[PDB]
Amino acid sequence: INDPAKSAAPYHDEFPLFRSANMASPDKLSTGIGFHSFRIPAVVRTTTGRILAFAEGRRHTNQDFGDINLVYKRTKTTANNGASPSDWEPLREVVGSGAGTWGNPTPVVDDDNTIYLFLSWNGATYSQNGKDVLPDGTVTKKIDSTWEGRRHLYLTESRDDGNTWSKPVDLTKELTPDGWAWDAVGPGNGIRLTTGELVIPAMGRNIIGRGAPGNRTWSVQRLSGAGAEGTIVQTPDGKLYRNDRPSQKGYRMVARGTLEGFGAFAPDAGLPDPACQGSVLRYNSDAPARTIFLNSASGTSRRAMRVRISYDADAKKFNYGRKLEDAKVSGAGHEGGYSSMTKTGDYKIGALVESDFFNDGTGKNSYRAIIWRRFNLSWILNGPNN
Numbered sequence: 001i002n003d004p005a006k007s008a009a010p011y012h013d014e015f016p017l018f019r020s021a022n023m024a025s026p027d028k029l030s031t032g033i034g035f036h037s038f039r040i041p042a043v044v045r046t047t048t049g050r051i052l053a054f055a056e057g058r059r060h061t062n063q064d065f066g067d068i069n070l071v072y073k074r075t076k077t078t079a080n081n082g083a084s085p086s087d088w089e090p091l092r093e094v095v096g097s098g099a100g101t102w103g104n105p106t107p108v109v110d111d112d113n114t115i116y117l118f119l120s121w122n123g124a125t126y127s128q129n130g131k132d133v134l135p136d137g138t139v140t141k142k143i144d145s146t147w148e149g150r151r152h153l154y155l156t157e158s159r160d161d162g163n164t165w166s167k168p169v170d171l172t173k174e175l176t177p178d179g180w181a182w183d184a185v186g187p188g189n190g191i192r193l194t195t196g197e198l199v200i201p202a203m204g205r206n207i208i209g210r211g212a213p214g215n216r217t218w219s220v221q222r223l224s225g226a227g228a229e230g231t232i233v234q235t236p237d238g239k240l241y242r243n244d245r246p247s248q249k250g251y252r253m254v255a256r257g258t259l260e261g262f263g264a265f266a267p268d269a270g271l272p273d274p275a276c277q278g279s280v281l282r283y284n285s286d287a288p289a290r291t292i293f294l295n296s297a298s299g300t301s302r303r304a305m306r307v308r309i310s311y312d313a314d315a316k317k318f319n320y321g322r323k324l325e326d327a328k329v330s331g332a333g334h335e336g337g338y339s340s341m342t343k344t345g346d347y348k349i350g351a352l353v354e355s356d357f358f359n360d361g362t363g364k365n366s367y368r369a370i371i372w373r374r375f376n377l378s379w380i381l382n383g384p385n386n
């Protein structure tokens with residue numbers, strides 16, 4: 001019942017980390033290339049302590065399709081824990097080739113400090129729904145089951161602590177079931193199990209990595225009733241836990257299992273969700289073991305961000321937690337949407353959270369920004385709503 005962390009001085013700090021085209025000092029690459037919006041965050045701490053923050057750089061609009069590059073920023077040092085804006089390097093690029101979509105960043109750090117980054121790709125003239133108008137007036141084809149028209153699964157990696165990345169290798173034929181059209185990896189993060197394997201959540205399946213760190217053999221674990229956008233964590237009992245976005249507004253969809261297979265997905269009545277991505281973090285395994293969860297705690301709105309703790313060996317129930325609005329950021333738009341968490345080297349939780357200026361309401365011209373937050377467990381536990 002007791003948590004020693006509650007007695008620690010609570011700590012929080014927050015500031016925009018990916019600054020959209022409308023903001024002062026917008027984030028652009030060294031080449032001069034800029035971005036309307038940043039969406040779809042992912043963050044990991046490497047074995048050195050450096051933090052790598054990834055996002056989709058959406059070139060022209062906030063839309064999911066069209067010219068989108070995979071961007072990132074690193075902490076300048078391995079020891080600064082991204083505490084302040086001057087602790088972060090300028091925007092860099094993992095991959096941006098072509099006018100198609102490079103996205104769904106889903107990283108995982110392997111034992112040797114190889115950072116794997118799983119990505120989704122689609123072509124310049126395709127979108128999920130089809131018939132969408134691109135900036136130049138071209139009308140999209142619906143994503144389909146052809147090589148040119150399907151969603152691809154790519155893999156890139158860094159061997160130098162995120163400083164450089166390989167040209168992404170296409171693993172669609174290997175790790176995406178044949179005849180598929182739409183696909184998604186993550187987005188958010190994969191995990192490394194106590195038992196040594198990697199697990200990357202994807203649509204309808206987990207991607208499993210076995211063998212030597214940074215030189216893994218990959219295989220597909222097919223799942224029944226999973227979502228398109230999944231999260232994975234190892235719970236304190238050592239079991240696996242999928243917590244997926246629901247197909248329709250309502251609740252998070254949870255299933256538990258092992259590398260030998262999963263049980264059925266069922267909605268967690270304790271975790272409302274507006275049909276949006278969420279994130280999950282394995283915090284610690286010694287008493288009191290903790291799992292962290294972040295999403296929008298609402299059946300209707302993405303503007304209800306709430307970080308929570310579970311002390312259950314199977315993460316059966318999460319506490320009420322704390323609303324991120326208790327520590328709001330100013331001048332970055334309306335916070336809420338997709339999220340990603342890591343642990344920092346100075347015993348904080350680091351979270352990336354989407355934010356929306358809403359200047360064009362629900363429309364394509366609404367600038368999207370990404371917030372970086374740090375808070376400790378004490379901050380979570382001393383919230384007004386626990």
Ligand SMILES: O=C(O)C1=C[C@H](O)[C@@H](O)[C@H]([C@H](O)[C@H](O)CO)O1
Nearest residue numbers: 040064128182184228229275276
């Ligand atoms: O902000 C969203 O709702 C969203 C953003 C991503 O860029 C899309 O790949 C994703 C996808 O449309 C759903 O998972 C349904 O397949 O949705």
Ligand code: NA
Nearest residue numbers: 096097098099
């Ligand atoms: Na591009």
